């Protein structure tokens, strides 16, 4: 997307695995605020806009 048009997309009613993200072997500045990325997969929250 563009930064004049980064749309607030709603991906819903499915599941997103994050363990392949740590083994993607390409991340540069992977920054998690609030909760640690170790405890991201097991517990989830509402409002999962992207």
């Amino acid at each position, epitope marked *: 997307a563009s930064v004049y048009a980064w749309n607030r997309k709603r991906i819903s009613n499915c599941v997103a695995d994050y363990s392949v993200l*740590y083994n993607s072997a390409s991340f540069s500045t992977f920054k998690c605020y609030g909760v*640690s990325p*170790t405890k991201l997969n097991d517990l989830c929250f509402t409002n999962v806009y992207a």
Partner: nanobody
Amino acid sequence: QVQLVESGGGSVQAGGSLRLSCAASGSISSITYLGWFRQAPGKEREGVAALITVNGHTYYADSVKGRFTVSLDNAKNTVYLQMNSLKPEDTALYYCAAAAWGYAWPLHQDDYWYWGQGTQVTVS
């Protein structure tokens, strides 16, 4: 809440070998990322070595590429930094840093790290 104790420094000639260590104590399972720093006299503290604890992925700077190795020992709770093929531009104060938020390549000083006391490595 995370205390780092580092050792293994000393003086060695050019072409020699050294092996730094940095033991961790506290909330060990929350720490996801260990990075090694280096601050030369007259230069800014930059990023040299990097290691994700969960993934095992190693990241090295371009000035130390092909020479420097970082390894993790979960049983002794201590990250290592083996010094191979040393040159006299490596005379600096080295620092080990721990992160409980994730990984960031390149290393930056302004992020939140658990800082140690630093070890003097002098080569000539």
